[PDB]
Amino acid sequence: GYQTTGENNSSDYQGIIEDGEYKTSKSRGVGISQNSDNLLNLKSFEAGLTTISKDHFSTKSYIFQEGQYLNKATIQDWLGRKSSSNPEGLNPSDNGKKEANKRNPIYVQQIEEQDYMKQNNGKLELAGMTIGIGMNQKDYYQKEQYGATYSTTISKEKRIEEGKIAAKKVLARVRQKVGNNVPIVIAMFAQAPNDSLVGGYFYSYTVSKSGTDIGSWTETNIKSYVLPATEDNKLPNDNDSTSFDNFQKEVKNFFPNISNVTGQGQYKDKTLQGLHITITTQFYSETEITSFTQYVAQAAKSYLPSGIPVDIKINGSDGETQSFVSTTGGNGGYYTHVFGSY
Amino acid sequence: GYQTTGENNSSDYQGIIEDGEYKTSKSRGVGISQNSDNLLNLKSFEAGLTTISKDHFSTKSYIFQEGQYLNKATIQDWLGRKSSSNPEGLNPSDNGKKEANKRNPIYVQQIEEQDYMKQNNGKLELAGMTIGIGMNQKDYYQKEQYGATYSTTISKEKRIEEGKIAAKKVLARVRQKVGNNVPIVIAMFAQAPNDSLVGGYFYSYTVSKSGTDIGSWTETNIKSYVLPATEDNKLPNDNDSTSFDNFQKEVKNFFPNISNVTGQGQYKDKTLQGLHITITTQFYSETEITSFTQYVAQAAKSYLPSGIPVDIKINGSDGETQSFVSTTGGNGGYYTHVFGSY
Ligand SMILES: [Mg+2]
Ligand SMILES: [Mg+2]
Numbered sequence: 241g242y243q244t245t246g247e248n249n250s251s252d253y254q255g256i257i258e259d260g261e262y263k264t265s266k267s268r269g270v271g272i273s274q275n276s277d278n279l280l281n282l283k284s285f286e287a288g289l290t291t292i293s294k295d296h297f298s299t300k301s302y303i304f305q306e307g308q309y310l311n312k313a314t315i316q317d318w319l320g321r322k323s324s325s326n327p328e329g330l331n332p333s334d335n336g337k338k339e340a341n342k343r344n345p346i347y348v349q350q351i352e353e354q355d356y357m358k359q360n361n362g363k364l365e366l367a368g369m370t371i372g373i374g375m376n377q378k379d380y381y382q383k384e385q386y387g388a389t390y391s392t393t394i395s396k397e398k399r400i401e402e403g404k405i406a407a408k409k410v411l412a413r414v415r416q417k418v419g420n421n422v423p424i425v426i427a428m429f430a431q432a433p434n435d436s437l438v439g440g441y442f443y444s445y446t447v448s449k450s451g452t453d454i455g456s457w458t459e460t461n462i463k464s465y466v467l468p469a470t471e472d473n474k475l476p477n478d479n480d481s482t483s484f485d486n487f488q489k490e491v492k493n494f495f496p497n498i499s500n501v502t503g504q505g506q507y508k509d510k511t512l513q514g515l516h517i518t519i520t521t522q523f524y525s526e527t528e529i530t531s532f533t534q535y536v537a538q539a540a541k542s543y544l545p546s547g548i549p550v551d552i553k554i555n556g557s558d559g560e561t562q563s564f565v566s567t568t569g570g571n572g573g574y575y576t577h578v579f580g581s582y
Numbered sequence: 583g584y585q586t587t588g589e590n591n592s593s594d595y596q597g598i599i600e601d602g603e604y605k606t607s608k609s610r611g612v613g614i615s616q617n618s619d620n621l622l623n624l625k626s627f628e629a630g631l632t633t634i635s636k637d638h639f640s641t642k643s644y645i646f647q648e649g650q651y652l653n654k655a656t657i658q659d660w661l662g663r664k665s666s667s668n669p670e671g672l673n674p675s676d677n678g679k680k681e682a683n684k685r686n687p688i689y690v691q692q693i694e695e696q697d698y699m700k701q702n703n704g705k706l707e708l709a710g711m712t713i714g715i716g717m718n719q720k721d722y723y724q725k726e727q728y729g730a731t732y733s734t735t736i737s738k739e740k741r742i743e744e745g746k747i748a749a750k751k752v753l754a755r756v757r758q759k760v761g762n763n764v765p766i767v768i769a770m771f772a773q774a775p776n777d778s779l780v781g782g783y784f785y786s787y788t789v790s791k792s793g794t795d796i797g798s799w800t801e802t803n804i805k806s807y808v809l810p811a812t813e814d815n816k817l818p819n820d821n822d823s824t825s826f827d828n829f830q831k832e833v834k835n836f837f838p839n840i841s842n843v844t845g846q847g848q849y850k851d852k853t854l855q856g857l858h859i860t861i862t863t864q865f866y867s868e869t870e871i872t873s874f875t876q877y878v879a880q881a882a883k884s885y886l887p888s889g890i891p892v893d894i895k896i897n898g899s900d901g902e903t904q905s906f907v908s909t910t911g912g913n914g915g916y917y918t919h920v921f922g923s924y
Contacts, residue, residue, distance in 0.1 A: 246876025255873035283923035531597035534588025
């Protein structure tokens with residue numbers, strides 16, 4: 241039969257085990273290949289789809305089911321170019337043209353489904369769905385076989401337009417599979433370019449309560465930014481940026497050997513929501529790890545912006561995590577853990 | 583001047599920053615080379631030296647100083663064979679013999695110092711010291727240049743005897759450097775062999791309150807054991823072993839792809855004190871990580887021995903830690919953290 245994973249709570253969904261195995265997505269793997277040139281796009285797409293879901297289908301009242309209605313083959317077809325051989329393709333036909341401004345580009349890069357279930361007489365019933373559609377900003381391609389990479393820059397306006405076109409087709413198709421009564425949230429994502437140190441971002445969503453017409457769109461403004469910031473990639477808040485810089489300076493030279501400090505800040509508009517930081521250093525003893533971990537927690541509380549969740553992973557040179565330091569936010573909240581040897 | 587790292591507390595020592603840098607050991611690095619054929623010996627030696635220290639020099643009343651009195655060069659000399667060129671060597675002279683039962687073996691493999699300080703008029707003063715001496719069980723060596731590895735098996739009796747001989751020399755030498763009034767704990771360790779999946783163990787200690795004579799020895803019995811257990815390497819408690827096996831079985835097949843589960847159990851005599859477990863699996867999405875992490879916490883609470891600290895690191899296939907699950911012990915205590923993307 242089915243059992244849940246996890247307990248009922250206000251932060252995460254319970255998931256599903258069926259017949260002794262986690263009930264994996266019917267499209268498992270498709271996102272890896274669709275994002276091969278920048279896997280951070282997969283990670284931010286998925287993370288954002290889950291937060292959008294949490295805002296519409298409460299973790300307290302829905303169980304999360306990995307998407308079952310759209311399988312890998314179907315998503316692969318939809319992500320292909322339309323042709324007489326692939327009539328369901330959402331991307332434009334190959335007009336044969338090699339010029340970046342004349343070709344029909346790939347507008348649609350990834351699609352994921354998350355299903356939200358309610359319990360009915362010991363059985364799960366589909367009660368909500370979130371669909372993400374990831375749209376290219378740059379579409380990379382080759383003029384020749386193992387040859388050089390070119391790109392078509394898709395304007396924000398065109399991306400938005402083609403996203404709405406794709407959303408309407410996806411909604412029509414999904415409605416045939418799930419029926420007319422399930423609320424469906426469709427969330428539009430902009431893929432980061434291949435050289436980006438952060439994944440892409442969600443820019444809008446719509447909620448279809450019934451039918452196939454697309455109603456309003458609600459614009460969204462959650463974005464991630466690399467740390468430390470640079471002249472070309474500034475944070476929305478300079479004070480947060482200088483705070484990070486202070487933390488980095490305070491940590492970097494703890495040992496004779498310099499420690500690398502990088503991270504991401506998540507913003508809603510211009511307001512910092514959280515920090516994720518990774519420190520990488522060379523440790524040569526367990527007591528060095530204990531001391532550094534204490535000092536990182538001190539430096540974080542002193543110098544990093546307060547009142548927000550901060551997670552700091554402390555890795556050795558080989559990438560093995562030796563400790564971590566965190567606060568959920570509020571105040572007096574840092575926590576540490578060292579993954580020591582017996 | 584000096585500042586501490588960390589806050590005053592009952593679980594860890596505060597450490598020392600001097601002139602903007604952590605005050606590293608004067609023998610930093612020596613343990614890496616002394617344990618090259620099994621680095622788990624370094625890790626368990628250091629971890630155990632810290633726990634022995636905590637039992638004698640309270641974390642609430644001493645600051646930890648990385649060993650300053652014995653430098654790398656001196657430890658290297660002491661760990662060498664005695665000769666007219668190296669009169670301070672603690673290991674026997676090279677009698678030139680190639681037969682494993684005729685050669686003088688290397689008895690002494692590693693030495694580490696930890697210093698414990700009290701504050702006096704804004705200055706730190708040496709108030710205690712722990713010295714570990716690691717003794718071989720098997721001593722590996724070559725009869726020829728880039729040639730084959732042989733070993734001398736050193737009996738438990740001989741190891742113990744030679745350990746006491748080495749301890750007395752180390753005590754005499756250290757007393758000249760630190761004076762006659764500082765309590766010195768000398769802790770004897772047995773190196774694990776080169777193929778061991780666990781580091782070695784502390785077998786005895788003595789406390790020198792003054793002078794150079796070695797008093798009693800107190801036998802100790804903390805040991806680590808690999809998980810899952812095997813016919814050749816059983817846990818001291820079969821019920822703990824079968825409990826681990828149950829946990830492993832319950833986790834292993836969560837995904838279509840099998841998950842590897844290994845670990846260590848720390849025992850005092852025959853009584854389990856704690857578990858460290860590492861799970862390694864292939865994740866393809868952030869929702870898979872959330873669900874697995876919940877389920878690991880459930881399985882741990884259901885099936886693993888209760889009333890002890892358990893730490894479970896959950897790694898992806900590339901060794902990157904994706905989440906972890908822990909309880910300090912007692913009851914209703916599991917905690918989880920997912921290192922998710924924004
Ligand atoms: Mg320095
Ligand atoms: Mg299976």
